[PDB]
Design an enzyme around this catalytic site. Sequence first.
Site, mmCIF file in Angstrom:
data_model
loop_
_atom_site.group_PDB
_atom_site.id
_atom_site.type_symbol
_atom_site.label_atom_id
_atom_site.label_comp_id
_atom_site.label_asym_id
_atom_site.label_seq_id
_atom_site.Cartn_x
_atom_site.Cartn_y
_atom_site.Cartn_z
ATOM 1 N N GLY C 26 17.484 25.647 56.883
ATOM 2 C CA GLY C 26 17.296 25.881 58.299
ATOM 3 C C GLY C 26 18.062 27.079 58.802
ATOM 4 N N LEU C 27 17.451 27.843 59.692
ATOM 5 C CA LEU C 27 18.114 28.970 60.347
ATOM 6 C C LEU C 27 18.823 28.422 61.592
ATOM 7 C CD1 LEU C 27 16.559 32.572 60.860
ATOM 8 C CD2 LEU C 27 18.849 31.749 61.602
ATOM 9 N N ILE C 29 22.690 28.868 64.386
ATOM 10 C CA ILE C 29 23.584 29.643 65.240
ATOM 11 C C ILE C 29 24.463 30.565 64.406
ATOM 12 C CG2 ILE C 29 25.590 29.533 66.838
ATOM 13 C CD1 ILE C 29 23.290 26.425 66.311
ATOM 14 N N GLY C 31 24.435 31.042 61.224
ATOM 15 C CA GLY C 31 23.729 31.661 60.096
ATOM 16 C C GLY C 31 22.710 30.746 59.457
ATOM 17 N N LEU C 96 20.921 16.764 54.515
ATOM 18 C CA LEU C 96 20.134 15.840 55.276
ATOM 19 C C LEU C 96 18.696 16.278 55.151
ATOM 20 C CD1 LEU C 96 22.431 15.918 58.378
ATOM 21 C CD2 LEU C 96 22.235 13.991 56.786
ATOM 22 N N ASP C 139 27.413 20.476 71.961
ATOM 23 C CA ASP C 139 26.128 20.975 71.524
ATOM 24 C C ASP C 139 25.269 19.857 70.963
ATOM 25 O OD1 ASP C 139 24.315 23.064 71.226
ATOM 26 O OD2 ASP C 139 24.842 23.387 69.097
HETATM 27 C C1 YRZ Z 1 23.466 19.315 56.661
HETATM 28 C C2 YRZ Z 1 23.468 20.196 57.734
HETATM 29 C C3 YRZ Z 1 22.158 20.690 57.938
HETATM 30 N N1 YRZ Z 1 21.685 21.556 58.874
HETATM 31 C C4 YRZ Z 1 20.369 21.858 58.892
HETATM 32 N N2 YRZ Z 1 19.827 22.723 59.759
HETATM 33 C C5 YRZ Z 1 20.469 23.043 61.012
HETATM 34 C C6 YRZ Z 1 20.142 24.446 61.476
HETATM 35 C C7 YRZ Z 1 20.844 24.736 62.785
HETATM 36 C C8 YRZ Z 1 20.508 23.678 63.831
HETATM 37 N N3 YRZ Z 1 20.627 22.341 63.318
HETATM 38 C C9 YRZ Z 1 19.978 22.060 62.065
HETATM 39 C C10 YRZ Z 1 19.541 21.243 57.846
HETATM 40 C C11 YRZ Z 1 20.162 20.330 56.902
HETATM 41 N N4 YRZ Z 1 21.470 20.079 56.999
HETATM 42 N N5 YRZ Z 1 22.208 19.213 56.182
HETATM 43 N N6 YRZ Z 1 19.217 19.849 56.074
HETATM 44 C C12 YRZ Z 1 17.897 20.329 56.462
HETATM 45 C C13 YRZ Z 1 18.074 21.373 57.574
#
Ligand code: YRZ
Lengths: 282, 283, 283, 283
Positions: C26-27, C29, C31, C96, C139
């Site tokens: 996932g893109l 804040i 990075g 996740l 947030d």
């Molecule tokens: C831990 C953190 C995390 N962050 C993620 N993506 C973030 C991108 C920024 C906004 N919130 C979601 C994703 C994840 N994970 N796993 N797995 C699939 C996509």
Amino acid sequence: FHVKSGLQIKKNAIIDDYKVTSQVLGLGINGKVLQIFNKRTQEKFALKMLQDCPKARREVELHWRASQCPHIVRIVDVYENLYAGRKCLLIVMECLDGGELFSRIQDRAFTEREASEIMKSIGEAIQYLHSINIAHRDVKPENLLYTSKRPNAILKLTDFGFAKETTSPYYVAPEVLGPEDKSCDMWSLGVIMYILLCGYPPFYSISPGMKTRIRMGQYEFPNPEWSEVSEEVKMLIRNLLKTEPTQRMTITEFMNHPWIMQSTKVPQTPLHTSRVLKEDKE
Amino acid sequence: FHVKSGLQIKKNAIIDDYKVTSQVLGLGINGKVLQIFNKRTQEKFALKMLQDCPKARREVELHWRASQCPHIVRIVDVYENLYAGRKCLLIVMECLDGGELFSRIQDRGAFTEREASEIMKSIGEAIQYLHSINIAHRDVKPENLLYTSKRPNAILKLTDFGFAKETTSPYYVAPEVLGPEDKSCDMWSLGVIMYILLCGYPPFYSISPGMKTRIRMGQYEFPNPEWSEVSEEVKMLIRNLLKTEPTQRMTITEFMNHPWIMQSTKVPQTPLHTSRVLKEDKE
Amino acid sequence: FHVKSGLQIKKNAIIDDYKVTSQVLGLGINGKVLQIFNKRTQEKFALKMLQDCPKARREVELHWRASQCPHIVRIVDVYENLYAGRKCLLIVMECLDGGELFSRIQDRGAFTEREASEIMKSIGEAIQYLHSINIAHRDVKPENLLYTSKRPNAILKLTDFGFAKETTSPYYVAPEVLGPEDKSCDMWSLGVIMYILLCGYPPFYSISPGMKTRIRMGQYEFPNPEWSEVSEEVKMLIRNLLKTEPTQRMTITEFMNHPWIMQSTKVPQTPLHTSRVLKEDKE
Amino acid sequence: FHVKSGLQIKKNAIIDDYKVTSQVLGLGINGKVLQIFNKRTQEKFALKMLQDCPKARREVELHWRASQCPHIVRIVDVYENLYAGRKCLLIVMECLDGGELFSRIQDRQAFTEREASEIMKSIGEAIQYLHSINIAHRDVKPENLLYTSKRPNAILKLTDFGFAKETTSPYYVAPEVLGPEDKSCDMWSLGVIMYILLCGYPPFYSISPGMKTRIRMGQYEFPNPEWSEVSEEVKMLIRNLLKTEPTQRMTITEFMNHPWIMQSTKVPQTPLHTSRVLKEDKE
Ligand SMILES: c1cc2nc(N[C@H]3CCCNC3)c3c(n2n1)NCC3
Ligand SMILES: c1cc2nc(N[C@H]3CCCNC3)c3c(n2n1)NCC3
Ligand SMILES: c1cc2nc(N[C@H]3CCCNC3)c3c(n2n1)NCC3
Ligand SMILES: c1cc2nc(N[C@H]3CCCNC3)c3c(n2n1)NCC3
């Protein structure tokens, strides 16, 4: 035209008017509270001594103003004398002999109606103070004593050592009348009401976790202590124990509340207070 | 694409467009309110005069923005002329002839609850508009609520923007984050007005430094026989308006959503003692 | 004597412990979030890269403390390495895979109220933990609420501590006396999320400076047919969360004691229009 | 090239290395001192827990530097762990079983002057080390002077660095020019301790604002029959330590060069009343 006397600070030696004994009535914040006797009347009075400074003089003056209120320990006379070359301030008050609040409750079946009568009396002390722009800031059971061991005794607030004054067109809002806190008095009222209805604080100890439980606002009404206590009463506690001071109940709102306002017409549902309080754990 | 005109400050002598009389409609904060006549139409208008300064220009500019609202006295045109060598600012408004709020109520000797509600709704719409465009009136009282005509279909309108003040310069952003702002005083005022409408006297009489206490403490009553027949819902609404603490007090959006206000049509006609009690002028 | 480890910032090259792929999960804040594999275990993990600075080190340190909570994405290890001569801070978390909150809701075309409550309870526990250790997320939105797996037993977890901030440095001491602190924005966010969960759209749409108004004013509706079948209790809970004034708003402790949350098991299954309404992506 | 290790703050759970019991060795300023056991060696150690902050980290660092000194309680290892979500700092020290300074003296035979001097020399070496590495203890009192074992060969050791503070950031350069700095309070403390060791009671009893006076003024006696047999040299040494004005007071380097301290071996055994007088506990 109902006028009362101004405060007179007597400069003559206190021993001219009173026999001062060494009997310590109670150790406290500002010092030992000593038992003394009026030479001319022979009545028992309490004596409190403080180092004479403007802060000291300010508190005494507040207490003096407050002494008109039936539920605030009455200052009978104030002296400014010299003790050991240090300029001291000697405060004489009515001797409250009936003991602290919780001491009387445990020495006896404790009814809800009687808790309300206590809370109403404590609230009148706060109402008077707040209505003359005074914040006590130390309302706790150690500072609520009965006048006599008698069961008709009136409950009275004491210790004005943290007391502080809260201030120097029919549509003018309260905010516009000027900037002021006295919400801490109402928090204290909520803690006292909690212990009265059950027998233990709403925030025990562990200790940095107790700082959390207060800040967060987490406390319970656990059975079997609280099972028989109404939702109305629990709601009143909840509004007193509001974390945010602006959300919390004011004294005027408290005193208008039916449970307080109708101390006569209120259930006698027994409380576990007397039992639970008995646990001294020496 | 609904666009309205900007404020034009006319520099030409007002006497070119209007006949200015010496008839005083009402003495007030910023001075006398004079009756004037449009030359070309012959309609009656009110005229308010102020010394021309940026503070004055700011209030007028707020009133102008507000004049789109049905329950706010309408500014028809504004002039900047020279009077006695001093630079003055002449404000021309729709003329309200129907008299002050309470004056109309006492001159019908039975006042119904339903009608008090309709009043509070109309006063509330004025505050809602102002608050919704970040303006705080800060002088909402009956003196500044007048009817357009002596007619009983008259619309009630808010006046006197002399204390008016502006309150300002991703779907999860909270209200606090949008910026720092007070307009709670307008809601306190709303509560006092509602109290007097339902009974006929203030919730804080005069003794005088004791009246400062009763306001600061928040102590007032709903005494019988005035309030006996008035519901617990209505008393609760007053109680939320007359909260001592401003952050605890009711907002305008909440007030207008409240059923008593929201259903001014479907509300009891339970008679009030207002007209009777109000009749005590004590000259 | 329940003690857990302190945060250890590993200085060794992350490539020694993990195979870092170029797959973007996932893109965001701070990075891109990259997928990585533990060499010794072969498990999938997520990698977030930040420029190493005390602000970065503070947030990471908060997330670390928070990682003990069941509903907060777990930080498994943190590295400080040198990338392109710039000093970087590489954060490894549990991957996740179950997707964002509302994505899982719309991919079941029949969403019950009871299930909304269990979600709000889980999200609330994440806030309760943070607030109880003096951390404010600042947030909390659905983008940052993801499921652990596509599995329906998946647990929901809060992510992105980039705006997280610490809220801090005798049985009668009041909460105010313990010291000055805001975390009410987390509760507002909780109210917005709850609104969308029960209906399928925000309580403040867009038009845009008019949406700034509707927030500041507190004007939102519970329109039918979405909300007709939803109880007054639930609407009341949203109303206390969406209080304009932060001091009036509901606290986390109060939220979690509320029966709808406290009794997530013994709660109606009254169908919601969420899944249907949510389906309108409008690409 | 005599180099020792730097301070390593271990991040791993302390329970991995030690068995932490619930046995309280002593209640103190910063908390309970708990008894713990090294898993690998099975030796007894003391554990002190603090909330982890830069101030806490600063003191520990000072104590660590100080731990090389024979007469300062030795820090064996330090951990930074997470306890109850709060970030804590766990300090492991050698365990001093021999009890406090005065406790040993009373539990015995007569108490000789020669032995008091040896105690004062041992306490002085602790101060000398600290002051020579620009550390001021600021809490040197008997409660913080403990013996290593109940054995009579036990070495006396200083403890509690909670008030410790660092006193700083051409052969004719004066000390003033080297930089601005107080550690004279440690010498006052040394004077009080020496007074009590020679006689059995403080030089300033309590009567409480009058005890504040006696200190500020510098009024104390050497009353008989406690002091009658004690030499003018020893009394003179006390008088230099108990100087009111800190710049007048004896420095540590001067104290240790003084013959009574410098010749602890070649010093009279003239019995003291200390053991007798100290026995008055007054329960
Ligand atoms: C831990 C953190 C995390 N962050 C993620 N993506 C973030 C991108 C920024 C906004 N919130 C979601 C994703 C994840 N994970 N796993 N797995 C699939 C996509
Ligand atoms: C007036 C004031 C007072 N204060 C007393 N004791 C104080 C000591 C300080 C904290 N509150 C209680 C006692 C009293 N009185 N009488 N009589 C018996 C004990
Ligand atoms: C517009 C404004 C206005 N102001 C008026 N009078 C003001 C005077 C100042 C306080 N409020 C009332 C009157 C008016 N109007 N019409 N018509 C009759 C009297
Ligand atoms: C190292 C440090 C320490 N501190 C101790 N206790 C401290 C408590 C705080 C004030 N000074 C005494 C005890 C110990 N130790 N050992 N062993 C027995 C009691």
